[PDB]
Paper text:
In the D12_H06_D12_H06_D12 crystal, both the N-terminal and the C-terminal [name] units form similar paratope-paratope interfaces with two symmetry-related molecules each. To accommodate the capping repeats packing against the central [name], the inter-domain angle in this DDD construct widens from 120° in the model to 140° in the experimental structure. The rmsd for the comparison between design and crystal structure of DDD constructs with H06, H12 and H15 ranges from 1.5 to 4.2 Å.
In this paper, we present a strategy to fuse specific, high-affinity protein binders to obtain multivalent or multispecific scaffolds of predetermined geometry. DARPins are used as building blocks to confer the desired specificity to the construct. A series of rigid connector modules replacing the [name] capping repeats allow to combine the individual [name] domains in such a way that their distance and angle can be altered to test different geometries, bringing the binding partners of the DARPins into a defined spatial arrangement.
Author numbering: 12 to 473
Write the structure that this text describes.
């Protein structure tokens, strides 16, 4: 067609008026020459933006193919016409269309070093892994042609996507070629963020061996450990912790990994976070603790566990207010750690008289035994806390309780030179003749430790 021929050349020559006159005269907007080039092809190749937009407004096929599989987007990517690339994509151009050789627009922008075009193509979903007929990726071409900044950009985008998808072999080869293991997307997520979010234990391990920053923050302050505590990946939480992950990292909302674990019902992850130093008392902007979030979400099994851990620590530490506030929240007064120590055990050992009274006032077991038979009175007699010894005895403490070795409170008081406690125990019915499993009486122990005055008292009482 002569009209079509006139239109093709009018578009190739940048004659904006001629194009409009010819379209008004019925010229086929999608005419093709001997090799399949349409007016939109030629306008994109020659960089005539106005015509590109006119042809599209008149029904030009944005993805028209020449005989070799080139689209208008291929040609704009080749010639470096950023604005035409942007307009073509707006109108539905195939960002990943491949020619007969498997070449995509991203290959061409990387091959010829069009940085801004590479960035726009990636933003529009360009496939960084696309290989042409010869197995070349856009990165390979960038490197082959010495476009080193674009090559690193392609490595970064690839590593972020490979990490998210769990493609170990890809991740390894990307870092072998110099991929930045600590790159980030627009949100601030690093490859480690994405592997932990998606639950790829193998990738997390490989990333960390290659120097991944375990405490990378995103825009909102989220750490990889935050994400693993959110998603519930126990082993990943463990691996992150072993590699220096911060147990109490905080985000803009004030939430720590323990907040996330407790909110999303990850009991095992709460236990691991506690065992690794998680702060049960931390608070977020809304003014809530990990315990508060667990109770609201119906996880009493987690709420109680947080109360248990907090009570033992606060009882040991001597923090009376926390104890009283934890009792008001329903903390188990008789909870025990792995050794069997209750809050009362730990308050007596440390000499925290006030706390002893509170715990007893709230139903604490005055004769609770640890795994070895030590009662709270045993520990008070050991450390020499006269007031605590008297409070315990007043509350029904067993003055002659024997541990697994047959040791009684009087043995310990005599062995460690607490005369005033000896007299108190004797006054409360302590058995001066009790022998431990080695045949030792309190008298005998006082002698072995050079406590003359106590030995004299114990002898007369016999």
């Amino acid at each position: 067609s002569d009209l079509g021929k006139k239109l093709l050349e009018a578009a190739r020559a940048g004659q904006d008026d001629e194009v409009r006159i010819l379209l008004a005269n019925g010229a086929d907007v999608n005419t093709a020459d001997e090799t399949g080039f349409t007016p939109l092809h030629l306008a994109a190749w020659e960089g005539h933006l106005g015509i590109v937009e006119v042809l599209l407004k008149n029904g030009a096929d944005v993805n028209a193919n020449d005989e070799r599989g080139h689209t208008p987007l291929h040609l704009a990517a080749y010639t470096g016409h950023l604005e035409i690339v942007e307009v073509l994509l707006k109108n539905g151009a195939g960002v990943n269309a491949t020619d007969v050789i498997g070449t995509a627009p991203l290959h061409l922008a990387a091959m010829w070093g069009h940085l801004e075009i590479v960035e726009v193509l990636l933003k529009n979903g360009a496939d960084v892994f696309a290989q042409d007929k010869f197995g070349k990726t856009p990165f390979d071409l960038a490197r082959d042609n010495g476009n080193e900044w674009i090559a690193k950009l392609l490595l970064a985008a690839a590593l972020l996507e490979a990490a998210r998808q769990g493609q170990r072999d890809r991740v390894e080869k990307l870092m072998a070629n110099g991929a930045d293991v600590n790159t980030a997307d627009e949100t601030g997520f690093t490859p480690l963020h994405l592997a932990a979010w998606e639950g790829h234990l193998g990738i997390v391990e490989v990333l960390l061996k290659n120097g991944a920053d375990v405490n990378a923050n995103d825009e909102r302050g989220h750490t990889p450990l935050h994400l693993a505590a959110y998603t519930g990946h126990l082993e990943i939480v463990e691996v992150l912790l072993k590699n220096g992950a911060g147990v109490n990292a905080t985000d803009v909302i004030g939430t720590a990994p323990l907040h996330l674990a407790a909110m999303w019902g990850h009991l095992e992850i709460v236990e691991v976070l506690l065992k690794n130093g998680a702060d049960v008392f931390a608070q977020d902007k809304f003014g809530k603790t990990p315990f508060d979030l667990a109770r609201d979400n119906g996880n009493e099994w987690i709420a109680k566990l947080l109360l248990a851990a907090a009570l033992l620590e606060a009882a040991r530490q001597g923090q009376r207010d926390r104890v009283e506030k934890l009792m008001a929240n329903g903390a188990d007064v008789n909870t025990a750690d792995e050794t069997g120590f209750t809050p009362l055990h730990l308050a007596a050992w440390e000499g925290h008289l006030g706390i002893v009274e509170v715990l007893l006032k709230n139903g604490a077991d005055v004769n609770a035994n640890d795994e070895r038979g030590h009662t709270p009175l045993h520990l008070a007699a050991y450390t020499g806390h006269l007031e605590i010894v008297e409070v315990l005895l007043k509350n029904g403490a067993g003055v002659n309780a024997t541990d697994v070795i047959g040791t009684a409170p009087l043995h310990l008081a005599a062995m460690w030179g607490h005369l005033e406690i000896v007299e108190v125990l004797l006054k409360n019915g302590a058995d001066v003749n009790a022998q431990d499993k080695f045949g030792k009486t309190p008298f005998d122990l006082a002698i072995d430790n050079g406590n003359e005055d106590i030995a004299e008292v114990l002898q007369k009482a016999a």
